[PDB]
Amino acid sequence: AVTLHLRAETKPLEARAALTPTTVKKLIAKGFKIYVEDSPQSTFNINEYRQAGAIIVPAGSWKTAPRDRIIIGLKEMPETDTFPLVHEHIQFAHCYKDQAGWQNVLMRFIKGHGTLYDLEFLENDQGRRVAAFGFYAGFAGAALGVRDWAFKQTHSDDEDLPAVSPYPNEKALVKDVTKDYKEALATGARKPTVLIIGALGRCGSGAIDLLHKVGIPDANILKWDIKETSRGGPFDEIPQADIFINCIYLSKPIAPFTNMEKLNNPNRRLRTVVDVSADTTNPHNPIPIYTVATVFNKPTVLVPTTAGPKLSVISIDHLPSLLPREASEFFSHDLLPSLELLPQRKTAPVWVRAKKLFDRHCARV
Numbered sequence: 001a002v003t004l005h006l007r008a009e010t011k012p013l014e015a016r017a018a019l020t021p022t023t024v025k026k027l028i029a030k031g032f033k034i035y036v037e038d039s040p041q042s043t044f045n046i047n048e049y050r051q052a053g054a055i056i057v058p059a060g061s062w063k064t065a066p067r068d069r070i071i072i073g074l075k076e077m078p079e080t081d082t083f084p085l086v087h088e089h090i091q092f093a094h095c096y097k098d099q100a101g102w103q104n105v106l107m108r109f110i111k112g113h114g115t116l117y118d119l120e121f122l123e124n125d126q127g128r129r130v131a132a133f134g135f136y137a138g139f140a141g142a143a144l145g146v147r148d149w150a151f152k153q154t155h156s157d158d159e160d161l162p163a164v165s166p167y168p169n170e171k172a173l174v175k176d177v178t179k180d181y182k183e184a185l186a187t188g189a190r191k192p193t194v195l196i197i198g199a200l201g202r203c204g205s206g207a208i209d210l211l212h213k214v215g216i217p218d219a220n221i222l223k224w225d226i227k228e229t230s231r232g233g234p235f236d237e238i239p240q241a242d243i244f245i246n247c248i249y250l251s252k253p254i255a256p257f258t259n260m261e262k263l264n265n266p267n268r269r270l271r272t273v274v275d276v277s278a279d280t281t282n283p284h285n286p287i288p289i290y291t292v293a294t295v296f297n298k299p300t301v302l303v304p305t306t307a308g309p310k311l312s313v314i315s316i317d318h319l320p321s322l323l324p325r326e327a328s329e330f331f332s333h334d335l336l337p338s339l340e341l342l343p344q345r346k347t348a349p350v351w352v353r354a355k356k357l358f359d360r361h362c363a364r365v
């Protein structure tokens with residue numbers, strides 16, 4: 001039997017969890033022993049885990065836990081923590097892409113005789129990433145995009161979309177976005193068209209699902225993927241759409257999707273751009289119209305146009321935190337088949353690939 005120990009997150013406002021009560025129940029049904037730290041910040045109530053069969057333990061107790069427990073969490077270790085890491089860990093460690101102090105992160109493992117299985121690079125047998133948050137990133141990005149567009153119909157340009165807060169469940173989010181949307185329509189606003197780039201993937205599907213659920217029909221959604229962008233930008237369709245949602249991270253030096261010249265047009269319709277995969281450290285940002293990474297407490301940034309109506313960007317890197325419960329359920333269920341192979345992790349390719357990758361980065365230190 002494998003023992004997993006779900007550590008409490010400490011990163012500010014991180015309410016997601018790598019295992020949910022549901023995935024815990026499912027692992028227990030397979031003979032796992034599951035410990036769950038009593039986490040202040042989690043969107044899940046600790047009673048949920050208890051009722052699932054988890055053994056509840058104090059927050060931070062992983063640090064003194066027996067060597068044989070596999071420690072599982074989402075976020076990287078606090079850069080401040082210096083003690084050797086003696087356990088096998090499953091987490092996003094953020095030390096494989098030459099991040100600052102990456103060697104020190106790994107030295108903690110080396111000194112400890114611990115092992116990292118990094119969630120960012122966990123790969124199935126067909127070479128695809130096992131678990132990520134793209135669907136809910138798209139769903140939340142579409143939600144905020146519609147909210148921003150609606151807001152613009154009912155408020156003056158000197159006001160911006162107010163601070164946003166996570167929702168306890170998807171229905172609650174949809175109810176609020178629908179309310180805002182219908183209010184905007186009731187003013188006689190032309191029904192908006194929404195252009196999505198990367199429409200066919202998980203992120204794109206998430207955005208589309210939100211749009212559908214708030215009453216936006218396919219007739220008003222322009223679903224673009226590789227074929228549509230292959231002609232090369234800039235695309236006139238972007239300023240012509242009311243809302244533009246970008247659902248694919250692109251960092252190689254190609255022609256941009258849009259630019260200030262194209263946006264500086266009194267006939268532009270576009271009001272709101274949601275760059276779901278925004279990363280201001282992108283070496284070749286194909287939507288070169290913002291430099292600010294916006295955040296929940298100030299979710300939009302002005303695009304400084306010289307003609308046309310007020311245009312704003314949403315460039316939040318934490319969109320899945322808008323719905324931490326569902327984000328966690330999707331993530332943990334995507335990860336579940338791999339977790340079920342942990343008893344055979346010495347031979348199961350998903351885990352062997354991860355150990356090998358860890359070993360290779362440790363060798364560079």
Ligand SMILES: Nc1ncnc2c1ncn2[C@@H]1O[C@H](COP(=O)(O)O)[C@@H](O)[C@H]1O
Nearest residue numbers: 134197198200201202203225226229248
């Ligand atoms: N340059 C591009 N233009 C438009 N769509 C793209 C481009 N590159 C990748 N995609 C699509 O983006 C989606 C990414 O899917 P996912 O990683 O599941 O969110 C897939 O449907 C890809 O085909």
